[PDB]
């Protein structure tokens, strides 16, 4: 499949550099942000299903699932929420600077906790705390499955997905972790972060653990 390439709005590039280069601790907050996002997407499909219950048939179980892939230095955060169409990915993940982008950068620079990023509506970008590359793989009931991809540089690509597992419906955040952030592949560390910062989640959070049979 041929990829389409898009330039990030300048303010989003600025934001990504600020997060990549300027913040030094409490990097674990990325997980609470991505779980909150996943929870929002699940709320949206649950709400939609109230008056359109057939919307659930593409994936009847509502869940958040976290999968460390230590060989690839990858952490995946999956939800069976509403998902995003190709146009939604292009419009919401880089071409248009959302309300809050500039406000957050100003707040961070004046000394706000990076943990406040979610209150500005740009917490997705907190993944660049631990990752230097990301794929967002998404399946809306209203479109085909698509892959958005960024390498923390100034452009991103969107490509029709003929390479990943079918998700019935929903989204996978595939984070390619930095070498100094591989603690986030460890079962105990993930459980710790979830229990400490994501205590009030309405959906089950599943952790996929790969272990050698002795
Ligand atoms: C297309 O509109 C989306 C919301 C919109 C981008 C505004 C929004 C809503 C949030 O809960 C959090 C937001 C931003 N924070 C963000 O930083 C952004 C820009 C997220 C992109 C969307 C997720 C990849 C995406 O995460 C996911 N797991 O699907 C997400 C939260 C999608 C929403 C369901 C969808 O309604």
Could you describe the 3D structure shown?
There is one protein chain. The chain has 214 residues and is α+β, with helices and mostly antiparallel strands. The chain has one domain (1-214): Histidine kinase-like ATPase, C-terminal domain (Heat Shock Protein 90). Helices cover 29% and strands 22% of the residues. The chain is globular. The N and C termini lie far apart (42 Å). 34% of the residues are buried. Bound molecules: ligand BC6. The site of the ligand CO[C@H]1C[C@H](C)Cc2cc(O)cc(c2)NC(=O)/C(C)=C/CC[C@H](C)[C@@H](OC(N)=O)/C(C)=C/[C@H](C)[C@H]1O has 20 residues, from helix 2 and helix 3.
Structure summary:
It is classed as chaperone. With 214 residues, the chain is α+β, with helices and mostly antiparallel strands.
Please tally the β strands and state the result.
8
The CATH architecture term is 2-Layer Sandwich
Regarding CATH, which class?
A: Alpha Beta
Structural class: alpha+beta
Family: Belongs to the heat shock protein 90 family.
Protein name: ATP-dependent molecular chaperone HSP82
Binding site for ATP: 33, 37, 79, 84, 92, 98-100, 119-124, 171
Subunit structure: Homodimer. Interacts with the co-chaperones AHA1, CDC37, CNS1, CPR6, CPR7, HCH1, SBA1, SSE1 and STI1. CNS1, CPR6, CPR7 and STI1. Interacts directly with the substrates GCN2, HAP1 and STE11.
